RNA sequence: GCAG
């Protein structure tokens, strides 16, 4: 166990023993970025590979060069939290050591005239925090892994979807990592064509002639020859007998003898074997056997020098006669047998108009750069810049691996650019696929799709920035100032840093992190995305890429995926899925050696997984390893079948191998329909953290893993004893086993209290341990948001009854009791930041002040004299938080306002109230105020007060860390001093600082005292230089945006309580909106008087078949039935013998479970602490697809003395009489989702209007206005509502003169409209008349 | 079909607000067309009553007071 | 000039400062974002709000629940008008300050100005004209619009996070069109087929089905009753079950040929619940309309009969009475779903073992080469489909009459009172096709390319799907979900083309 | 990125 797991042991019902613990759930992000920024002496990964890919940089003339020696990341200027506060990226400076070598002018080598070596700064690269996030502009962003088509050659088809003849048309496509695409394809006439970058197609032999192949060499490559040799007479023909497989001869075959097959008779393999048994190598055929045969060589004359027949020339008897007259007794001829060796290449040698290499290069030029006259020296440079230069074409290492793997080569490494051999082999494999001896690639196979992740996309963008700077440094190196310039005078850091800046901030895959709960974070990091740059688009992405493939098994979750327009494009990585070193997903299996399932795991990729046959995880096996069955369900080719127990090669490592981490948390997942499992998996990530986290009574066993492997919690790095514990810090006194020599031996954990998540929730850590408690390496010391004792806890254990109640849970509504509101169960804290920005305007600067015009002194009662609100103020909607006035001019009073002010004399004010106010309906507590002043603006009293508070706090925190650490050092010194020459009567009175220099008998202990005194002196040296850094970071002026003078950010904390409209859910896709908050006495109650907390609709179960939610209810009643049994034993104060016996009877229940809790090894203190943690219900673990059977649920129900049907009889609370049927009552785990009705309710009568067209503005942030779309206009045209429609068009929206007349008419009590023309129609008329089209209105 | 019949109305405003605005507007421009605003999209676009429903009486009054 | 007028038509678009093409004069007026469609054919509208919908089943058919905090804002000029008219504010600025302070008199003014003033509630997608309907507002305290249940089927609304938009008819003509053309008590029939669209659903129909059924030996059977009031007194006293077959004197009125109602009185053989339900039936209707077990179709036909015989005004009262009595008696039954309600036939394991014997026989016949892989596969599919139908028949026969109870000692089978079966049989939720997957086997699945997998999911959701069967399940579930996601854009475009041709 |  642990000491943190025997506080409360979750009763495990899983039966399969696990052989592979769940890995670090954020390995994708952390490993990718570690490959990116770590030093790699081999030079394959990250910044080192990117630098060696660009450097060295020769000049145009080669006289000088800029080479690269090493790089180095600086330390960040601000730590992560200062970056989140000041709104700046958390990055490290990339300092790269370059060397400018100047060769000599006249030298046999260009010997070194000079070297100038120095360290040039190029850019700041953002840093992954220790949780897999980036703080980019103060917001935490996750760079999502991309799933893109691997580079390589992909053979595909369109399955007769062209030319209506149902003819399957094949195409190869060479896709590189970077560079021009190269496709070959077939047309309906069986002619091989080629496209380059998907522009118009050429005959494919043009790219064969651009490579220096002639027509004769082409026909050599793609064909084999039937040699006709003229012996004595009658056209002897060399014979290879297998070329005669399956034809009908036009002539009988006689070779020196027996007639094998007569005329017009079909030839079968017996005839071929017969001809080879006779060893037939020669025929004499009819002379018209050459009517149609194509010569395969260049046959010219020797007598008259006339070119008789060049290559690719179809022969005829007259041509045969004129060819034989020149002494040509040897006639080489193409062997094209139909349906196995087509004429495709010899057919395209006739369709291309090209005869020579230069004409082919010209034709490729004309296709590529049209309209421009092709010259030789540019057409022959365009081609060797297309696919054959490393500057422009990189097929990469994955590209070359997949390339050779597709062409069945044995070498997996090579050059990144194409070759003659590669292109020719691709054409050969395309022709083979046409000839029926190949198969097209499945493009959604996960052997053809590749995970490109953070440290690879970041390196790609960095290398783009590097080529941007190296073109400029090539341009600068070829100048004549070459003797007096250093390398940092020719490096521009701004392109390089701008590439990574736009990647990390503006890419589609660099996303604002989900920070609702720990599950949202840790599932946003394990997210795969088909979209992004270099991937699909959610509109153009078809049906087939959105589907779940058979190779998604164990690699990509089938159920956790979105539900709207990008479904199947955003995927989630499965629990055990890794990536190859190439990026292809792989998943672990157990090896089955001889029928014995070994516990040796192998990570199989999607293509290897299809070779073996692989057992299930639900496949039973006994303790010897052997399958207890003999006919095992397995998967062999993506096909799934039954096999013997000795065909089985591998076995799935776990029963939850197939699902993601978020779907691994749905108990009884195997009973939900896959749609409702998808919805539950997607609504666990929208659940906000409540006030008091409540463990699930029914979990699956992944809750500890999700809570720890996400960094929301504070896990002990070294074991020890809690020396001090406090709501904001935990001081652990390390064991002497785990501490290093010369060390204080104390770990301080500073907890995070009431900070804002990205979703404005609060992320607050509470110390889980108590004082003096022994903790171990890995225990949870502090529960973060939505965790309870280290277990992920997203909702609360509500008591549900499934029954229709008086209409109030109609159509997915939820009827909540009032005790769920009294008990503050789903009350969640939400923290808003509101900024008031004092800018410099052209009429004078805005000032933050408490002398606000036209506002009484009751509203300015919460503001201090600086004009800012007091911290701790209970504000409501409409209250001023930051008083600010703007200077204004252009007053221009009306005549009536002039008279009104000449009567009363109350003059107009020259400043305009521009205050920051609480938004309407918000009611909360100011918990923090931050003031940012541009350097040069004087600070008000409050900014100085806040700075002095921050300096006090910095000095206090650093003096307290020094006090804790020096107390630990003095305790270690006291422990070492008494190990020899004991001073136990002397030591505690002498001044402790002299223990640093007390020379003892040096056996070896004075060495440790030397190191401990060095440690103390270093701590004293270090505290001062940390405190001075903190002082100069606190008092320094802020780098604000241009124009702004100061920024006041006020943080409101709003406790939102549950209320009708708030959307609750469970783990099984059973979402719902609260319809009524019912009194306690109205709720249905059982015979003991305990009312139900939540009444759900039973009609929501059978149509959407998430039966799991019923079982989790029945089990959640069993679990609580155990708890309220133990609870009883703690109120009668039974002996610990009776408690120990009953809890042991509860943990031993179940049919062949994997866990054994033997708590005779528990002390009585440990048993009473456990029994105290189980008094609110004993938590159960129902692993996914391995969970508690129905019989085990009934047995545990019988142990808690509850009815085994799970259905008790309930009484109506209102009339006191019984509902006529038993009612399912149990404890579901309800989640409060982030769709709160406080955030959705909006209303607007009049407001601000859009600028160009005068319609209302868009969203409830800008006071909105709802879009009366096109469909609603049709809905009003379908009734005859002409007047309602005409006011939706003119006076509610666009009519500028009609909207104010309608307003003053409503106020006058005259509900009548004076509609004009919509302004947007006038905008349209003016935008058509600006097109040179006179559009008019005819009177 | 419904698309080629939607774009072959006698009204370039209906047909131009449906789709293929460029074709409808150039053809109507060189032909010098005249949209008499008879349907419902032309009367929703200019902010008038639709000629169907409670705005049918008004349009009949409009075509009995301008044709005479 | 060619780039100013229509960018990107001749050759390459001109991109400015973003490598993102410039929006020319032609792009302002063309497309889904042009003036014609973004700004002229539909526009953003004042006096409009939006909130989550929630049930409120106490309502009448013609009223919605509008939160006070939304109604105070949507009706602000109306409140300023009444605040100055009634002398409670000297100036419209004083009135603005009064409604900002939310003084106690602006709530009385606000109760005055919404009184007979309807609002339009709209749920998007407004697929058909019943997607906008006018309701009279009832001011409530929450922040969620409270939508009367019977209209939800018209809006396609469930309360799982749906939000609806409120619009205010400003003038008198728009107020009278909302009252006379669009009020929800005018839209009780569907404009597509004629069938009622304000029709009871899941909870109402289950309450009315449970009420109008008959048990065999139910408490208080066979007694003779003076009328529906005596049935209600018996049932509320606990002296007769709601399903006790009794003899009750029912007075019912026929519409004469002239149009007036003539009475008739006869002891009908009914149950107690059909007698109780008769009390809400309007007059001109036969008693045979409730003297049966009322599913969804029987209630929809009852409402249609009331509409064609008696007209709109009694049908609206009838529909609200049906909703209230169905909600009430659905609550009284406590009709709950437990795990024992999914009774799996005990002949399921035998049927599946016989089907496995047959497919293994076909397989070892294929080893004997007498069958091609084609007809082997076809026959294996057909002898699993026969097993699936045998399992479904055994399940449903075991489910639908599993009540065998006593009359005068002798056992006798009746229709089942199983909750799953009452929900499927009422038409409340689900069909036999889903009870099949709860309690039978969930059958043969299809691969993503449509070819069905030769071995079925022999398991159902009451048992576990194992990990492989669940993977095979997701194969088709994601296909259905993606089909749903990408066919709404295919249907909305057809609808747009049809509206623009007509 | 999400909600229906
Ligand atoms: C050393 C390592 C295994 C041996 C080889 C095999 C696959 C190679 C990566 C891929 O090619 C993708 C990408 C291509 C870029 O061009 C450079 C970076 C990337 C990440 C490569 C780095 C490195 O070269 C890899 C990891
Ligand atoms: C028990 C423990 C070792 C003995 C002593 C030695 C150092 C002491 C802490 C420091 O003084 C800093 C700080 C001072 C505050 O005033 C009270 C809290 C803090 C954390 C102290 C707590 C406690 O007193 C400590 C841990
Ligand atoms: C540009 C390109 C394609 C589509 Sb689509 C679609 C629409 C909405 C949400 C998701 C996808 C589509 C195209 C190819 C394959 C699959 C989907 C689409 C096309 C016609 C009719 C309806 C939708 C839309 C715009
Ligand atoms: Mg909904
Ligand atoms: Mg988006």
Residue numbers in the entry:
A (entry chain C): 3 to 1341
B (entry chain D): 1308 to 1375
C (entry chain D): 303 to 804
Article sentences:
Bacterial RNA polymerase (RNAP) holoenzyme initiates transcription by recognizing the conserved –35 and –10 promoter elements that are optimally separated by a 17-bp spacer. The MerR family of transcriptional regulators activate suboptimal 19–20 bp spacer promoters in response to myriad cellular signals, ranging from heavy metals to drug-like compounds. Here we report one crystal structure of a multidrug-sensing MerR family regulator EcmrR and nine cryo-electron microscopy structures that capture the EcmrR-dependent transcription process from promoter opening to initial transcription to RNA elongation. These structures reveal that EcmrR is a dual ligand-binding factor that reshapes the suboptimal 19-bp spacer DNA to enable optimal promoter recognition, sustains promoter remodeling to stabilize initial transcribing complexes, and finally dissociates from the promoter to reverse DNA remodeling and facilitate the transition to elongation.
When including ribonucleoside triphosphates (rNTPs) in the complexes (see METHOD DETAILS), we obtained two structures of the RNAP-promoter initial transcribing complexes (RPitc) containing either a 3-nt de novo synthesized RNA transcript on the heteroduplex DNA scaffold (hereinafter designated EcmrR-RPitc-3nt) or a 4-nt RNA transcript on a fully complementary DNA scaffold (hereinafter designated EcmrR-RPitc-4nt). The RNA transcripts lie at the post-translocation position in both structures and RNA synthesis starts at position –1 and –2 in EcmrR-RPitc-3nt and EcmrR-RPitc-4nt, respectively. Compared with EcmrR-RPo, both EcmrR-RPitc-3nt and EcmrR-RPitc-4nt unwind the T:A base pair at position +3 and pull it into the polymerase through DNA scrunching, leading to a 1-nt transcription bubble expansion. Despite the same 14-nt transcription bubble size in both EcmrR-RPitc structures, only the longer RNA transcript in EcmrR-RPitc-4nt reaches and slightly lifts up the σ3.2 loop, indicating accumulation of significant stress on σ as the RNA transcript extends beyond this length. Other than the differences in transcription bubble size and σ3.2 loop conformation, the overall structures of EcmrR-RPo and EcmrR-RPitc-4nt are almost identical. The kinked spacer DNA conformation and all of the essential interactions between EcmrR, spacer DNA and σ70 NCR are maintained, suggesting that EcmrR-induced promoter remodeling is required not only for open complex formation, but also for initial transcription. Intriguingly, we observed strong extra density in another hydrophobic pocket (hereinafter designated site II) in the cryo-EM maps of EcmrR-RPo and EcmrR-RPitc-4nt. The density likely corresponds to the tetracyclic sterol head of CHAPSO, which is routinely used in cryo-EM sample preparation of bacterial RNAP complexes to alleviate preferred orientation problems.
